[PDB]
Amino acid sequence: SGISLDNSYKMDYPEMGLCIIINNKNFHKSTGMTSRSGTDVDAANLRETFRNLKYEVRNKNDLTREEIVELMRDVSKEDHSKRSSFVCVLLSHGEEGIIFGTNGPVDLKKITNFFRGDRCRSLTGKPKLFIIQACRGTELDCGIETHKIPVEADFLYACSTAPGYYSWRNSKDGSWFIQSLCAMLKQYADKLEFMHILTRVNRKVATEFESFSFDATFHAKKQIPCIVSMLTKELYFYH
């Protein structure tokens, strides 16, 4: 055998892996949370985009906090031995560190903990991608004119917005982040490493979108997504 390199994740397992999409649109009246118009556009775009990357996509709609936790636990208990990776997409209201079930909040840590290197052995050493369209607080960006491994290793959080900030969703077109993410994956998944795809997503969101509102507080605002990588290798969707 000739010289070997191992700077990239093995992505030629029999299966690419699961893509779990949690699409929360309608919230229990008692929570006072608004309906997330446009989120079905995001969910459909993600389903198609990841289907074409050969992920086994599962779409779930309007899950309570209990259902989110049980789904995640159950998924983490599957045998992923034949799968290259794992993807989870969360579309909901949020605050920093939190995603909302239809009836209340869920700690993101609680969700991702199920997939720790020591808790999901069939995903140990494989990339676990969490893609999140949700607010991280209420700040608005005004813009400016121009041998063991760590249990937290091999996670990537592709967050729609910077820490502390709102995240923007268009009721007609879908969210700025998800529409940009799907576009860049479609265009570049067969050509670029995933961090570089996400960097193009950052640029697209930052340059092509700006809010329009009759409310001065919410008008003319900008957004930058936030790539959080604990990955240990380059990730290419092809092989």
Binding site: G94, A134, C135, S167, W168, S171, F212
Partner: peptide, 4 residues
């Protein structure tokens, strides 16, 4: 445009 709406916020999440």
């Amino acid at each position: 445009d709406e916020v999440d």
